[PDB]
């Protein structure tokens, strides 16, 4: 597979110094975007520059065990925006990473961390994403 998201422009909400939005598409699963002052909601958008077939996305967090509530949406050149993964009511431990089928042409990826459920090992963690890949 080829990660067509790699080095694509990331826009979105404010970031902690040292942990910019650009860390979402740098290809490094260890480099993070972290929301500034741990603000929620926090959001990131990847511009794929026009419509590109995407088989699936991968959303990577720093490590397993957060309890973020989040959603992933895709959009085409049309303006048709659509939710592909909705974990906004999540209360359980999160996996380290999520595969998400798309199987169509898309032009943008939108990730939003809307909240966090109580408990687990990292209950004061700030909203943060290690990587989003778009495989074709
Ligand atoms: Ca990264």
Numbering used by the authors: 1208 to 1343
From the paper:
CpGH89 (EC 3.2.1.50, CPF_0859), also referred to as AgnC, is a family 89 α-N-acetyl-d-glucosaminidase that has been shown to specifically release terminal α-linked GlcNAc from the disaccharide GlcNAc-α-1,4-Gal and demonstrated to liberate GlcNAc from crude class III porcine gastric mucin. Overall, the enzyme comprises a glycoside hydrolase family 89 (GH89) catalytic module, four FIVAR (found in various molecular architectures) modules, an unknown module, a C-terminal fibronectin type III-like (FN3-like) module, and six putative carbohydrate-binding modules (CBMs). CBMs are presently classified into over 60 amino acid sequenced based families; the CBMs from CpGH89 all belong to CBM family 32, which is one of the most diverse CBM families. Thus, CpGH89 possesses a complex multimodular architecture where the composite modules function together to efficiently act on components of mucin.
The presence of two CBMs with the same specificities indicate the potential for a multivalent interaction, thereby increasing the overall apparent affinity of the enzyme for regions that display clusters of the GlcNAc-α-1,4-Gal motif.
